[PDB]
C-alpha cells in the first residue's frame, strides 16, 4: 500500500495484529519486529482548481489546492477551502467575482494581479429610526426589469437499436 506511517495510541490487544475501518481497508498495523502500533493514513489528495479571469483579458491564473495545508505543496494564502497560490491577498472587501469558498472570493484587478479577499455582503446603512420619525417619498421612478425563464428544452429522441447496434 501507501500511506504516512505514524506512531499511534490505539491500544491493540496482544493477539490483535492490524486494525480496519468502515471500508475494511487497513488503517492501523502492528510492526512485525517492534510490536508497536503504526497508524496508516493516506498521504495527501486534493482537487486543483485554476481560478482564471477570461483569457480574452489575461493569461494569469491562481491555483487553489482544495483542502490541503500550505505546507504539503511568490504569494501563498491559506483559505479554509485550501491553499491558494499565485493570488494576492487584499485587506479590502468587494463583491464576489470568482467564488472560492468560506467567504473568500478572487478577482482580477489592479499592474494588474489576481486578488483574493473576503467578500462583502453590502454597504452598511444605519436607518435613522426613532419613535416619532417617518420618511415619506415625494417622488417615484418607474423601472423595467428583465426576468428570463427557460420553458422548453430540446425535444430529442434516440434509436436504441441503431445506436447500440448500428446496422
Amino acid at each position: 500500500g501507501t500511506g504516512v506511517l505514524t506512531e499511534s495510541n490505539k491500544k491493540f490487544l496482544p493477539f490483535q495484529q492490524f486494525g480496519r475501518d468502515i471500508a475494511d481497508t487497513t488503517d492501523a498495523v502492528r510492526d512485525p519486529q517492534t510490536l508497536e502500533i503504526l497508524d496508516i493514513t493516506p498521504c495527501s489528495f486534493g482537487g486543483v482548481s485554476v481560478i482564471t479571469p477570461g483569457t480574452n483579458t489575461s493569461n494569469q491564473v491562481a491555483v487553489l489546492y482544495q483542502g490541503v495545508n500550505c505546507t504539503e505543496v511568490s504569494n501563498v494564502f491559506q483559505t479554509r477551502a485550501g491553499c491558494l497560490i499565485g493570488a494576492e491577498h487584499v485587506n479590502n472587501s468587494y463583491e464576489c467575482d470568482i467564488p472560492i469558498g468560506a467567504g473568500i472570493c478572487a478577482s482580477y484587478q489592479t499592474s494588474q494581479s489576481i486578488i483574493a479577499y473576503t467578500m462583502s455582503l453590502g454597504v452598511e446603512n444605519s436607518v435613522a429610526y426613532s419613535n416619532n420619525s417617518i420618511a415619506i417619498p415625494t417622488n417615484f421612478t418607474i423601472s423595467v426589469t428583465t426576468e428570463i425563464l427557460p420553458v422548453s428544452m430540446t425535444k430529442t429522441s434516440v434509436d436504441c437499436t441503431m445506436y447500440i447496434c448500428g446496422d
Binding site: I134, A135, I136, P137, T154, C165
Partner: protein, 204 residues
C-alpha cells in the same frame, strides 16, 4: 443576461456530445468500431466483444436517459414557474413581493426567446424620501382621531395627513379621519385642531 437560457441549450448539447463520444470507447473489447470486430472474428469469438460493447453503450444510454429525465423535471419546474408568472404578473397585478420584479408591480409584457420567455416587469419604486415628525393619532376635543387612509405627518409647525407612498399633504379634516375613544389610551398622541368644513358653511 441570457445565461439562464444559454446554459439550457449548452447543457443539452453537452449530453449529446458525451453520448456520441461514448461510441469511441472500447468497454473492454478490441475496438470501438463494431464492423471491424464483425469482419475480423468469427461469431463464437465476436460474441464476447459485441456483448462488452453492447453493455457499455446501453449503460451509457441509460445514464443519458436518467440525466434527461432529471433535467426535464428541472425545466418543467421552471416552465410551471413561468406559467404562474404569466398568469399573475401579466394577466393581472400581483401583490407578491419580488415575485413580479423588485419594487411595486404595475404590469408586465411577455416576450418570446429561444426555448424561453422574458418578462419586462414594470415596477413603481419610491425615489426621494423626506423626514417627517409623525403621530399615531391626534386629539381634537378629547377624542382621538386616526386617518382613514394615510398617515399623519408634520413639517415641524403644522400637521397634515398624507398617503403613505407619496407625500401629498392635506389639511386634517373630519373627512380624512375617524374618531375612536378618549385621548388617553393611545400612546404618542399629539394635540391639533381638526378643521371641519361643515362649520364655515353653517355660519354662511
Amino acid at each position: 443576461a441570457l445565461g439562464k437560457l444559454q446554459d439550457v441549450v449548452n447543457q443539452n448539447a453537452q449530453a449529446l456530445n458525451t453520448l456520441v463520444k461514448q461510441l469511441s470507447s472500447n468497454f473492454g473489447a478490441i475496438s470501438s468500431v463494431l464492423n471491424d470486430i464483425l469482419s475480423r472474428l468469427d461469431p463464437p469469438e465476436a460474441e464476447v466483444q459485441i456483448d462488452r460493447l453492447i453493455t457499455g453503450r446501453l449503460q451509457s444510454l441509460q445514464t443519458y436517459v436518467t440525466q434527461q429525465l432529471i433535467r426535464a423535471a428541472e425545466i418543467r419546474a421552471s416552465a410551471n414557474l413561468a406559467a404562474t408568472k404569466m398568469s399573475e404578473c401579466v394577466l393581472g397585478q400581483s401583490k407578491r413581493v419580488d415575485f413580479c420584479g423588485k419594487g411595486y408591480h404595475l404590469m408586465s409584457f411577455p416576450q418570446s426567446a429561444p426555448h424561453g420567455v422574458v418578462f419586462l416587469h414594470v415596477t413603481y419604486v419610491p425615489a426621494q424620501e423626506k423626514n417627517f415628525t409623525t403621530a399615531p393619532a391626534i386629539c381634537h376635543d378629547g377624542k382621538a382621531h386616526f386617518p382613514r387612509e394615510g398617515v399623519f405627518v408634520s413639517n415641524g409647525t403644522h400637521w397634515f395627513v398624507t398617503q403613505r407612498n407619496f407625500y401629498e399633504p392635506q389639511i386634517i379634516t373630519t373627512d380624512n379621519t375617524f374618531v375612536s375613544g378618549n385621548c388617553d389610551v393611545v400612546i404618542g398622541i399629539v394635540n391639533n385642531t381638526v378643521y371641519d368644513p361643515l362649520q364655515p358653511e353653517l355660519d354662511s
